[PDB]
DNA sequence: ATCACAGGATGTACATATCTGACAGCTGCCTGGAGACTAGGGAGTAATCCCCTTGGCGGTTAAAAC
DNA sequence: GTTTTAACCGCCAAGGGGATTACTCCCTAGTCTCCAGGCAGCTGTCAGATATGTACATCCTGTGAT
C-alpha cells in the first residue's frame, strides 16, 4: 500500500502551495526544467512577501479602528514601507487613495 | 536599389 | 444549473497567512484582490529573472539557487536577505523531510 | 456616434484631482491642458486594449485587456485581476 | 457681515478632504462615454465591461493625481503657489511623455 | 592552435540590409556590433510579447498573427503599419512558393 | 588690453564642441578607480574586463548627460540659468529616484 | 584597499558633462551633488552586476554582466554584446 | 497704533441606534496534486590551456588645480 | 594665466581563471493510479455604512490695549 499523501507545502512549513507553484512553472514557459527546491523556495518567499503586507495592513487597520483590511489600509502600507514602496513603486492600487501630504510652502503663516 | 515609402 | 469553471486564486493561503500574523482581522474582497494580483506580479517577476538567468549561463534547468539569485536582483535591502533566508530555511526543512 | 465627450471631465472633478495631488491654487489654463493629457493617456490606454481584445477575436473589451495595457505601458494595476 | 473664509483655507480643507477619502473624483457616466468616444477611433461596435471601465477609471485618476503632484512640486520650484501649463509640461518632459 | 568557439551574430544580413539600402557605404564594428544588439533587443520585446499574448488566449502555438499583434503593440504607429505590411508580404510569398 | 571673452561665450562655445563630440569625458583611470572602490563593498578580490569597464562608463556619462538636460531644464523654468542642486532634486524627484 | 576615489570625478569632467548637456552655467555646489548621483547610480549597476557574476560562478565581472544590470533598471545599453 | 484674545460661526471628530449585505464558515465533489517507479541527459566535477587581466615602470604633456 | 600632476602610452612580465573537454551519476520529465485540498455554492450574522445629535477645533474679524 502506498504512503499516506503529504502535501510538499505541509514538508517545508510553509503555507502557500508548492504543489501549485511548481505547476505553473512548469507550464509558464519559463525553461525547459524545474528543479525540485525551486518552488519550495518561490513559495517562501511570496509567503514572506504576504506576510509582510498583511502585517502592516492589518496594524493600519487597527490605527484606523477596523477590523476588516480594505484597499486603503494596503495602499498605506505599501507606501508607508521604504522597501514595498520601493519594490511597488509603479503600481496603482485600485480605491488605495494617496497618502495625508501637504507641502510646507502651501500650509498658512501659523 | 531598396527605398522606403515611409519617407517617400 | 451548471457550476461555473473554476478559477484558481491564492486567497485561502493569504487568509491562513493574515489569521497567522492577524488572528482577529480580516479582509475585504477587493484586498483579496488586490492581494492575489500582488502575488501573482512577483511570481510573474521571479520567474522571468530567473529564466533569463538561466539563458544567460546556458542552462535549462531552474532551481532554488536560480530564484534566490532572482530574489537577490529584484527585491530591494531588507527584503531581499530576509527573503532569502525564510527561503532557504523552507529549502533546508524540506530537504531534511524527504 | 459620441462626440465632445471631453467637456464631460468638468472643471470641479479636474480641481478635485487636483486637490488629492495637494494643489492649493489652480489656472484657468489648467483644465484645457489636463483634459488633453487626460485624452492622449486614455488614447494610449484604449488603443493597446482594443488591439489585445481583437487579438482574442472579441467584441467585448475585458477588465484583463486593460489590465493587461496598464502593464505593458508600466502602470501595473491591483484589483482588477 | 457673512462669514468668509480667507482665500486658501477652504483649498487646504478640500486637499485634506480629498487626500482622506478614497473614492473616484471623476462622474462615471462622462468618463465612460469618453472612453466610448476614444474607443470608437479604433474599432467600430466596441462593447464595454463594466469593471474594464472601472479600471480605466482608477488608472487615469491615478494618473492625473500623479501628474497634479509632479507639478505641484515644479510649480513650488518656480516659487510660485499655482500651477500653470507650463508646469504640466515640465513635468511630463522631465518624464518623459513629450 | 585553438580556434575560437562559433558564435553567431547578424552582421552578415544587416551588411546585406546595407547594401541594399546603400551600395556605397560602409559600417564599422562598433556601429555593427550596435546593430546586432539592436535587431537581438528588438527579437526579445517582440517574442515576449507573442509568448504573453498566447499565454493570455491560453494558446501553446506562437503563430504569424500572435507576432502581427505583438508588432502592432511594440511599434509606434507608421513604422508598426509598415512592418505589419512586410511581415504580411513576406508570409504570402513564402506561402505561394512552398 | 589682453582679449577676454565676456562670460558665456567660452560656455556657448564648450557646448557646441562637446555636443558635436562623442568620446568619453570623464577620465579612465579615475572612473575605473571608482567602480573598484563600490565593487569592493560587494566582492573582495574582483576582477573586471575592459570591456565591462567601459560600458559602465558608457552608462554612466549618458545617465549624467540626461540627468544635466533635465536639470538646465529644471533651472530654466526657475526663470534661471544657473542649475542649483535644488535643480538636480526636483529633477530625480519628478523622474522617479529619489 | 582603495579610497576617496569619488574625487576622481574632478571639476572639470563635470563641467564637461553639463556642457554635452546644454548646461551654460554651474554653480559651485553641483558637484557635490553629481558625485553622490553617479556614486548611487554606480553602486546599482555594480551590484546588479556582481550579483550577476556570483551567480554565473565567475570571478571576473564581464561585459555582459552590466549590460544585463542595466538592462535590468530599464537602461538598455547597444555595443557591448 | 499695531498687536493678543473674545467670541461667533462653521466644520469636523465622536458616541449612539438601525440595518444590511458582504464576509466567514460549512458541504459536496472533482480535478489536480501526491506516491511509486524508469530513462536519459543536464550538469557537477576533474584536468588543461592560453589569454586576458593585473602589476610595474619610465617618458610626455595635456589636463587638473590654483 | 601660471604651476603642478597624474593620465596616457608603450612596453614587459606573471599567473588566475575563463573556457573547453571528458566522464559519469543522479535529478527530473514522464506515466499511472489514487485520494483529498480547494473551489463553487449556500447561508447566517455582525462590521461597517448611514443617519443623528453633540462636543469641541479652528478660523476670522472686532476690539481693547501697553
Given at each position: 500500500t502506498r504512503a499516506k499523501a503529504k502535501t510538499r507545502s505541509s514538508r517545508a512549513g510553509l503555507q502557500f502551495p508548492v504543489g501549485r507553484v511548481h505547476r505553473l512553472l512548469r507550464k509558464g514557459?519559463?525553461?525547459?526544467r524545474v528543479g525540485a527546491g525551486a518552488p519550495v523556495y518561490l513559495a517562501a518567499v511570496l509567503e514572506y512577501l504576504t506576510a509582510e503586507i498583511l502585517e502592516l495592513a492589518g496594524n493600519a487597520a487597527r490605527d484606523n479602528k477596523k477590523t476588516r483590511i480594505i484597499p486603503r489600509h494596503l495602499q498605506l502600507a505599501v507606501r508607508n514601507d521604504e522597501e514595498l514602496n520601493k519594490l511597488l513603486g509603479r503600481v496603482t492600487i485600485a480605491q488605495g487613495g494617496v497618502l495625508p501630504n501637504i507641502q510646507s510652502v502651501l500650509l498658512p503663516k501659523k | 536599389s531598396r527605398k522606403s515609402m515611409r519617407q517617400s | 444549473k451548471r457550476r461555473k469553471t473554476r478559477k484558481e486564486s491564492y486567497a485561502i493561503y493569504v487568509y491562513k497567512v493574515l489569521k497567522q500574523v492577524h488572528p482577529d482581522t480580516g479582509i475585504s474582497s477587493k484586498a483579496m484582490s488586490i492581494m492575489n494580483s500582488f502575488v501573482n506580479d512577483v511570481f510573474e517577476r521571479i520567474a522571468g529573472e530567473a529564466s533569463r538567468l538561466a539563458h544567460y549561463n546556458k542552462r535549462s534547468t531552474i532551481t532554488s539557487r536560480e530564484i534566490q539569485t532572482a530574489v537577490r536582483l529584484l527585491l530591494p535591502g531588507e527584503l531581499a536577505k530576509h527573503a532569502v533566508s525564510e527561503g532557504t530555511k523552507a529549502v533546508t526543512k524540506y530537504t531534511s523531510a524527504k | 456616434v459620441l462626440r465632445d465627450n471631453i467637456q464631460g471631465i468638468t472643471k470641479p472633478a479636474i480641481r478635485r484631482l487636483a486637490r488629492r495631488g495637494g494643489v492649493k491654487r489652480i489656472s484657468g489654463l489648467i483644465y484645457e491642458e489636463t483634459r488633453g493629457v487626460l485624452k492622449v493617456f486614455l488614447e494610449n490606454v484604449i488603443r493597446d486594449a482594443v488591439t489585445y481584445t481583437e487579438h482574442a477575436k472579441r467584441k467585448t473589451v475585458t477588465a484583463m485587456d486593460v489590465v493587461y495595457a496598464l502593464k505593458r505601458q508600466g502602470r501595473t494595476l491591483y484589483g482588477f485581476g | 457681515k457673512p462669514h468668509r473664509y480667507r482665500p486658501g483655507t477652504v483649498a487646504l480643507r478640500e486637499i485634506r478632504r480629498y487626500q482622506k477619502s478614497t473614492e473616484?473624483?471623476?462622474?462615471k457616466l462622462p468618463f465612460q462615454r469618453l472612453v466610448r468616444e476614444i474607443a470608437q477611433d479604433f474599432k467600430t461596435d466596441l462593447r464595454f465591461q463594466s469593471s474594464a471601465v472601472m479600471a480605466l477609471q482608477e488608472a487615469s485618476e491615478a494618473y492625473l493625481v500623479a501628474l497634479f503632484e509632479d507639478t505641484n512640486l515644479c510649480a513650488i520650484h518656480a516659487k510660485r503657489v499655482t500651477i500653470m501649463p507650463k508646469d504640466i509640461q515640465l513635468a511630463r518632459r522631465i518624464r518623459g511623455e513629450r
Open positions: 514557459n519559463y525553461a525547459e | - | - | - | 473616484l473624483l471623476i462622474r
